[PDB]
Design an enzyme around this catalytic site. Structure first.
Site, PDB file in Angstrom:
ATOM      1  N   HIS A   1      39.862  50.648  39.082  1.00 43.34           N
ATOM      2  CA  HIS A   1      40.667  49.493  39.515  1.00 43.34           C
ATOM      3  C   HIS A   1      39.659  48.404  38.797  1.00 43.34           C
ATOM      4  O   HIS A   1      38.436  48.150  39.146  1.00 43.34           O
ATOM      5  CB  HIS A   1      40.500  49.373  41.084  1.00 43.34           C
ATOM      6  CG  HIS A   1      41.119  48.042  41.495  1.00 43.34           C
ATOM      7  ND1 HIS A   1      42.246  47.583  41.694  1.00 43.34           N
ATOM      8  CD2 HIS A   1      40.224  46.966  41.827  1.00 43.34           C
ATOM      9  CE1 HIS A   1      42.369  46.480  41.883  1.00 43.34           C
ATOM     10  NE2 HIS A   1      41.412  45.829  42.145  1.00 43.34           N
TER      11      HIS A   1
ATOM     12  N   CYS B   1      44.035  47.332  47.904  1.00 41.11           N
ATOM     13  CA  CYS B   1      44.356  48.067  46.478  1.00 41.11           C
ATOM     14  C   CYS B   1      43.990  49.551  46.378  1.00 41.11           C
ATOM     15  O   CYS B   1      44.090  50.070  45.316  1.00 41.11           O
ATOM     16  CB  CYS B   1      44.146  47.331  45.286  1.00 41.11           C
ATOM     17  SG  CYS B   1      42.617  45.968  45.547  1.00 41.11           S
TER      18      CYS B   1
ATOM     19  N   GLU C   1      50.346  46.615  49.679  1.00 37.88           N
ATOM     20  CA  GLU C   1      49.881  45.432  50.579  1.00 37.88           C
ATOM     21  C   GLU C   1      50.891  44.288  50.358  1.00 37.88           C
ATOM     22  O   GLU C   1      50.320  43.186  50.748  1.00 37.88           O
ATOM     23  CB  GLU C   1      48.381  44.931  50.212  1.00 37.88           C
ATOM     24  CG  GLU C   1      48.034  44.727  48.749  1.00 37.88           C
ATOM     25  CD  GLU C   1      46.804  43.976  48.726  1.00 37.88           C
ATOM     26  OE1 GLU C   1      46.529  43.033  49.041  1.00 37.88           O
ATOM     27  OE2 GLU C   1      45.837  44.505  47.923  1.00 37.88           O
TER      28      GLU C   1
END
Lengths: 387, 387
Positions: free
Chosen positions: B232, B110, B78
């Site tokens: 994450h 992400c 990104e």
């Protein structure tokens, strides 16, 4: 089989006449009409962004039942409105697709709808009850008075990838070819693409040639085997030069057929302009609707992305496919557009750069039955939905 | 089986100490060290961009023979440097991979390295002699004195997806969950992300919860079945709050194990910061190297992308996997970095924004053995290659 089950496109409701654009740019109208081979250029109102265009292309080809079965929504674009948030997420919401789906963008200039459908197909191999929605959506914007200007366009093409496809079965024969070249690119902070005019033609034709050469080698097939080709074109003349280069050692019968096919394939593009990731797939609709190809015949397709990546693959027509196209609606879509003067075009162009809303210029009261970008508040784009 | 055969990461050669950053920002050092749970933040020299970082993460895990077999190079980011040209094309060139390969980016904050490896796996099902290279590469940059500042990081993680993987077999159990939310996004023209602090925590934990709930339902599996999770995290404290929320109804034995696993998983991240698409996969390396998980045990993974998309899936450890990790090199990578003062950090930050080259600050004479961004001329980035 797995492949293209449904396919549709959307373009904005305005266009500028290419002969008038030529007049305003102080060149012979034929320079645009014949030299470049473009007749009408799509004109973007601010109320059509890549999200609303994508949603509009897709809304007519999915049922409520389809919405339960779509496992991924993939957007191909090089005209993103966000550096992080995939436009696929916004479209998935607008379309009311079931929530357990991957949503993301693929990016590689005008090539990216190709890996999307091809990997959508691989994804489906073990998932018999699922479908994938792929949307190519883009605005090819080079700038007022720029070299690329006459090639500009905007639109979106939606495809549903499914088992037992009703239109085209994708064959097991895709081969891609990557070379790091600077024909066209657009670094961060650049409004418009950078273009190396010394490389544009060569990079595009070389990618086609190298992808085709390797395909032919791997498959033991030749140009003679295809009912038609269908390939990415930035403008119809450049695509014609690529075609003639590729077919230049082929027999007369093949040459004549592929030339005929090309004229059918590039018909819609002639009245829209370049839509980057969607150009190939708009040509595919144009080809399927203008030509009377038979079930069991095979199309040879070539996808290009500047920078550069090319891919050659084939797809075979499925019996009954004509029943799943909408020539009449597509002809109406194009024909029901409004011509806009060159001065109006320039104003629309400047407004788009700035996302400057104007409900009067964009005539939004006419847009009750489509998605459109209605406002931006607190940096969040807001959308009107069909009533 | 198909899955992760090799995996490596790269981070830049500088970091700023989080206690000193706190001092300069006039807050208690413990606010960063404990409140946020970050110890050292990666600092980007201009000579490390997403391309050179990706190339550096990948170069050590591919042989000359691998270069013949890689059929796709997919970059998740990104933090793109181009709106059109995929960074995958540049990396493919730098790495000397065979030319008949697809190269493109995937984008969804992400989350994007996840569809890359999962679709890489589907792609490989019918291609027994091919491999896929997936590279997550990003710079999490929120701005000097911004709310997000203490969470910043930069780095890349490379994974080779292959048949008969030597490290982790990906199981047939991935489920994603999309909800259109504005927790974090970055519209065109925005240097740094927009962040809704009222939504950050909730959006992230809700995605984890909803993805996990559906996974558990589809698979008839529970938290108790996993040797550890790996998910994450934007900073270690936020990941800890997510963990405690997910495991809050589980038995003590499960809870203790998963807590232990989490501490192993987030160890490397503590000394780097958020690297967006690579954060999950950096944690995976950290987990695999710090913990002594056994062959045949299964990890439960959760991937998040702001905006938002989540995905839960599992992967099973393969006998001999420890032989394919490089704890020593990874520890050296982190330990051999140079601490940079807060004032130096700020100068590096401002230079990065402007891609302002400075061979002295970036100490490029030390970088003879890595890829680095050496210059930009005529809007084309140029790279030094390892000698």
């Amino acid at each position: 089989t797995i492949g293209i089950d449904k396919i549709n496109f959307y373009v904005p409701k305005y266009y500028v006449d290419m002969a008038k654009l030529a007049e305003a740019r102080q060149v012979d109208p034929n320079k645009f009409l014949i030299g470049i081979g473009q007749t009408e250029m799509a004109v973007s109102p601010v109320n059509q962004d890549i999200v609303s265009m994508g949603a509009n292309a897709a809304k007519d080809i999915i049922t409520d039942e389809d919405k339960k079965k779509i496992g991924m929504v993939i957007v191909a674009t090089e005209s993103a409105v966000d550096a992080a948030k995939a436009a696929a997420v916004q479209i998935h919401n607008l379309l009311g697709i079931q929530p357990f789906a991957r949503c993301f963008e693929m990016k590689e200039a005008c090539y990216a709808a190709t890996p999307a459908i091809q990997l959508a197909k691989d994804y489906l191999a073990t998932r018999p009850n699922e479908k994938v929605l792929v949307i190519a959506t883009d605005t090819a914007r080079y700038g007022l008075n720029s070299g690329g200007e006459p090639t500009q366009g905007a639109g979106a093409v939606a495809m549903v990838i499914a088992h037992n496809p009703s239109i085209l079965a994708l064959n097991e024969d895709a081969v891609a070819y990557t070379e790091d070249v600077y024909d066209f690119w657009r670094p961060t902070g650049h409004k418009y693409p950078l273009v190396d005019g010394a490389l544009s033609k060569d990079a595009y034709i070389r990618s086609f040639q190298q992808s085709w050469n390797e395909y032919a080698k791997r498959q033991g097939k030749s140009l003679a085997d295809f009912a038609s080709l269908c390939f990415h074109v930035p403008f119809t003349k450049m695509g014609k030069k690529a075609l003639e280069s590729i077919i230049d050692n082929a027999d007369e019968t093949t040459q004549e057929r592929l030339r005929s096919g090309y004229e059918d394939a590039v018909d819609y593009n002639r009245y829209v302009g370049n839509i980057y990731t969607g150009s190939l797939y708009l040509s595919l609709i144009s080809l399927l609707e203008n030509r009377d190809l038979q079930a069991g015949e095979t199309i040879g397709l070539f996808s290009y992305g500047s920078g550069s990546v090319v891919e050659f693959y084939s797809a075979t027509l499925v019996e009954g496919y004509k029943d799943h196209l909408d020539q009449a609606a597509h002809k109406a879509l194009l024909n029901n557009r409004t011509e806009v003067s060159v001065d109006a075009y320039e104003t629309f162009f400047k407004r788009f750069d700035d996302v400057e809303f104007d409900e009067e210029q964009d005539a939004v009261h006419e847009d009750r039955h489509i998605f459109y970008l209605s406002n931006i508040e607190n940096n969040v784009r807001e959308y009107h939905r069909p009533e």
